[PDB]
Design a protein around this ligand. Sequence first.
Ligand SMILES: Nc1cccc2cc[n+]([C@@H]3O[C@H](COP(=O)(O)OP(=O)(O)OC[C@H]4O[C@@H](n5cnc6c(N)ncnc65)[C@H](O)[C@@H]4O)[C@@H](O)[C@H]3O)cc12
Length: 140
Amino acid sequence: TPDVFISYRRNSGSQLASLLKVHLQLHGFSVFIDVEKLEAGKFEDKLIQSVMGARNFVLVLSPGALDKCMQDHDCKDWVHKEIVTALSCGKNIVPIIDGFEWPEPQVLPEDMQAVLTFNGIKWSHEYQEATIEKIIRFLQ
Ligand SMILES: Nc1cccc2cc[n+]([C@@H]3O[C@H](COP(=O)(O)OP(=O)(O)OC[C@H]4O[C@@H](n5cnc6c(N)ncnc65)[C@H](O)[C@@H]4O)[C@@H](O)[C@H]3O)cc12
């Protein structure tokens, strides 16, 4: 099963999520991203189980990526669901920051505020190899 789960906002982080997948696979990691590895069945259960299966949770924070999480107290938003699963399973969470502005904790539902306490990696378009090398250091 995959070592790394990539969580991303489809309308803004899909290209970076795909780029991360390629690089991490070239360095020998088994990676889950939905468009490559989510197969048949009820997607809610399969996606949550895939987060649970992976030791590492790579979170692509593109601009506004947590906006649809705000006030989503019923946890219907999928990035919210994936984050809460990763937090509650104690995953190695690795945020990747690409134009993202850190929100104040109290705008987010309580069950995901802890995502802001993890050390994040700044994506550098000018120094991508170095960014990737730092991500690999963060992976377990
Ligand atoms: N693979 C997945 C399948 C289904 C739903 C998913 C929702 C979320 N995700 C996870 O959550 C993050 C994205 O959140 P998001 O809020 O960016 O996503 P969207 O709500 O835009 O949906 C994403 C796309 O699935 C289309 N869609 C809607 N109903 C569908 C259906 N019955 N069968 C197929 N496709 C459907 C929807 O039309 C769009 O093309 C990622 O990390 C990812 O792992 C992955 C999904």
